[PDB]
Design a protein around this ligand. Structure first.
Ligand SMILES: Cc1cc2nc3c(=O)[nH]c(=O)nc-3n(C[C@H](O)[C@H](O)[C@H](O)COP(=O)(O)OP(=O)(O)OC[C@H]3O[C@@H](n4cnc5c(N)ncnc54)[C@H](O)[C@@H]3O)c2cc1C
Ligand SMILES: C[C@]12C=CC(=O)C=C1CC[C@@H]1[C@@H]2CC[C@]2(C)C(=O)CC[C@@H]12
Length: 523
């Protein structure tokens, strides 16, 4: 499947429009469905194309934490925060680079939240999760909001169409027993809201392949559904919110993107840069293709990874058996530090070192969560009764590994880490239950057996793609808009550059620029 552009005139020699809509949405992530809702709610006929047999993509896997600050939702919680406070935080991290999109992000958040909560299927609440950088306007508790838990019965036939959590989806399973939470709830509610409008068609196994141009304007796109090709006309526009290049090893190697397709937490085979490709084919510029939403990943027997988040013990060594980062860093800064320290394989993989404090468990949240016994049969993890035997089994220098652990244990006994300042930040302390020691993030590694887990450079999607303006319009290298073409989420180059400012920025940006694209199409 290549994403070459089809000219209207050339197609007129043979075929014709299968269907017509005002707004064609490609993808069914948080952005896609927010854009679809915005379009359909104000009377525009809308078609949503999902490539796979399940709506939601990585947005479904998410915890549905959303960085939409200064809204009616944080007002109800009485949060000491504002549009201007969130605007300062972004300015302090990102600078003047993309300041117009920074302004539009923070200024439009309130309207996106107000439009969505109006729908009986949608309600959010503030949930504490710290912002990720020391800077003016940081919220030590967070300012991010989450959809309310959703009883799958309230949405009928849509619950079985929603992609399940990673602990189910990569083991051939559907939703696990309780309610829909995190991204399952975000996608269930957005699907039900889009459907409530009576102006939207929701399609599974409908793949975008090529955009249709007349006289340089996008007028529609051919979508493959069940062996047959269809030609869908879009009177107002095509919103492309179909994710990034995360699943395409060839586009990543070409762009110089660190990590690997097989380490991405995107749904296997889903996000293969189809929409970025179709956008370049009609003259769209690209930026930041070497950038991803990075995270450490626990290497799996099958060669894939698990998102390692909320670290609360252990330490991490490079291939010399030495600490080189604060292991408690927010996952994107952790991942960037693995890549920066990588000297042809000294940091990728890294080795997470831990003891039996958690009964053999690795001291973090791993998504998905493979059983220790499985990692040990497979050799992704190794165990031993001594650090000397552990260094032997991993090929780590034994004397260095022993010094590293003895020095980390002295730091745990003292309650400060001289070397990397672990535990001296509200993000670091957030995940840690009280221990009987001075710093909750620093626990002496001394209760046998001892484990070494392989850590790789995973991602939560790439963040490079098509250049967009404040209204989600796709731009050519010259700054001019391609008429009828919008992109959002990881189809579009993030305003965040080399930064992951706080929880919910991927979904928050996606939802705001999808809303703004719909509004621009309404005219
Ligand atoms: C465990 C986990 C937790 C996370 N938690 C959060 C969080 O709380 N908040 C947050 O902001 N971010 C979070 N993230 C990151 C976030 O999920 C993603 O970066 C973000 O959702 C990307 O959304 P998207 O719209 O770019 O892509 P997706 O949500 O993946 O949507 C893309 C969709 O487009 C479809 N598609 C692809 N190609 C085509 C095509 N050719 N035609 C039609 N459809 C196509 C795909 O199948 C997919 O369904 C988390 C990630 C993970 C893995
Ligand atoms: C770190 C995270 C991810 C990316 C992002 O952007 C925002 C968040 C905050 C919410 C957590 C989520 C990851 C998954 C978590 C840990 C859960 O399973 C419950 C709360 C979720």
């Amino acid at each position: 499947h290549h994403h070459h552009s089809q000219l209207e005139n050339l197609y007129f020699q043979g075929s014709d429009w299968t269907s017509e809509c005002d707004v064609l949405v490609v993808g069914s992530g948080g952005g896609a469905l927010t854009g679809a809702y915005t379009a359909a709610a104000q009377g525009l006929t809308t078609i949503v194309l999902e490539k796979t047999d399940r709506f939601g993509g990585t947005s479904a896997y998410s915890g549905a934490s959303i960085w939409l600050p200064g809204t009616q939702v944080q007002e109800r919680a009485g949060l000491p925060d504002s549009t201007e406070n969130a605007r300062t935080y972004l300015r302090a991290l990102l600078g003047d680079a993309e300041s117009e999109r920074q302004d539009a992000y923070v200024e439009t958040a309130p309207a996106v939240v107000a439009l969505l909560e109006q729908n009986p299927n949608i309600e959010f609440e503030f949930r504490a999760f710290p912002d990720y950088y020391k800077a003016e306007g940081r919220m030590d508790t967070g300012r991010s909001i989450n959809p309310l838990d959703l009883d799958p019965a309230d949405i009928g036939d849509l619950a079985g169409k929603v992609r399940p959590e990673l602990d189910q989806d990569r083991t051939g399973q559907d939703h696990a027993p309780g309610p829909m939470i995190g991204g399952r709830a975000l996608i269930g509610r957005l699907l039900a809201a889009v459907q409530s409008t009576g102006k939207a068609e929701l399609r599974t196994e409908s793949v975008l392949t090529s955009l249709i141009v007349e006289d340089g304007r996008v007028v529609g796109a051919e979508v493959e559904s069940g062996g047959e090709t269809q030609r869908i006309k879009a009177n107002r526009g095509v919103l492309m919110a179909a994710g990034g290049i995360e699943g395409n090893a060839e586009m990543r190697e070409q762009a110089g993107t660190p990590g690997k397709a097989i380490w991405s937490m995107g749904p296997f085979g889903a996000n293969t840069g189809d929409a970025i490709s179709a956008g370049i084919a009609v003259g769209g510029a690209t930026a930041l293709l070497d950038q991803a939403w990075f995270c450490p990943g626990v290497e799996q027997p099958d060669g894939s990874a698990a998102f390692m988040v909320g670290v609360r013990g252990g330490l991490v060594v490079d291939s010399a058996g030495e600490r080189y980062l604060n292991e408690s860093l927010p996952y994107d800064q952790f991942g960037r530090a693995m890549d920066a320290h990588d000297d042809n394989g000294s940091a990728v993989p890294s080795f997470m070192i831990f003891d039996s404090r958690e009964g053999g468990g690795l001291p973090a949240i791993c998504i998905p969560n493979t059983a220790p016994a499985k990692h040990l049969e497979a050799g992704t993890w190794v165990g031993a009764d001594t650090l000397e035997e552990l260094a032997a089994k991993t090929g780590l220098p034994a004397d260095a590994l022993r010094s590293t652990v003895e020095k980390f244990n002295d730091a745990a006994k003292l309650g400060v880490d001289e070397e990397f300042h672990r535990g001296e930040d509200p993000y670091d302390a957030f995940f840690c239950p009280p221990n009987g020691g001075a710093n909750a993030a620093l626990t002496a590694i001394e209760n046998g057996p001892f484990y070494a887990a392989r850590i790789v450079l995973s991602d939560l999607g790439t963040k490079g793609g098509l250049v967009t303006d404040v209204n989600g319009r796709v731009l050519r290298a010259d700054g001019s808009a391609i008429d009828g073409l919008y992109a959002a989420g990881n189809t579009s180059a993030s305003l965040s550059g080399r930064f992951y400012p706080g929880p919910g920025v991927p979904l928050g940006t996606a939802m705001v620029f999808s809303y703004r694209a719909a509004q621009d199409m309404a005219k």
